[PDB]
Design a protein around this ligand. Structure first.
Ligand SMILES: [Cl-]
Ligand SMILES: [Cl-]
Ligand SMILES: [Cl-]
Ligand SMILES: [Ho]
Ligand SMILES: [Ho]
Ligand SMILES: [Ho]
Ligand code: NA
Length: 129
């Protein structure tokens, strides 16, 4: 599923991501924009053989099981395919663990490089929230 901007903002809010660990909703929408272009089915291979999945490009190296990332962990206790669903529950619940790992949203390199320090509230402008 390819979400609209405000559609994704609303879904993220319903799943409790707004201000989760102090990160306003615009931060999460911005991260999703640059990680996946709001596409739940996005995947991308990493240099180490791991794969990133879903709207927030969650890596199989640590967070989900895809059966082909030898030596990895599955800390969100989910198949990576769950991160591709039209229902964002799995991606959100796993993102909540990730952002709690210590480095906050710096875990998403695209957030650090493209959202951090910018006017991220623009990403929820106009949305009914
Ligand atoms: Cl915001
Ligand atoms: Cl594996
Ligand atoms: Cl933080
Ligand atoms: Ho990535
Ligand atoms: Ho970590
Ligand atoms: Ho609201
Ligand atoms: Na894994």
């Amino acid at each position: 599923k390819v979400f609209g901007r405000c559609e994704l903002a609303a879904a993220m809010k319903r799943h409790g991501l707004d201000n989760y660990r102090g990160y306003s909703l615009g931060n999460w929408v911005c991260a999703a924009k640059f990680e996946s272009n709001f596409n739940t089915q996005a995947t991308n291979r990493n240099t180490d053989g791991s794969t990133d999945y879903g709207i927030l490009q969650i890596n199989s190296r640590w967070w989900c099981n895809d059966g082909r990332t030898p030596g990895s962990r599955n800390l969100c206790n989910i198949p990576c395919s769950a991160l591709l669903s039209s229902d964002i529950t799995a991606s959100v619940n796993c993102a909540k663990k990730i952002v709690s790992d210590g480095n906050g949203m710096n875990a998403w390199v695209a957030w650090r490089n493209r959202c951090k320090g910018t006017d991220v509230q623009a990403w929820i402008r106009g949305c009914r929230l």
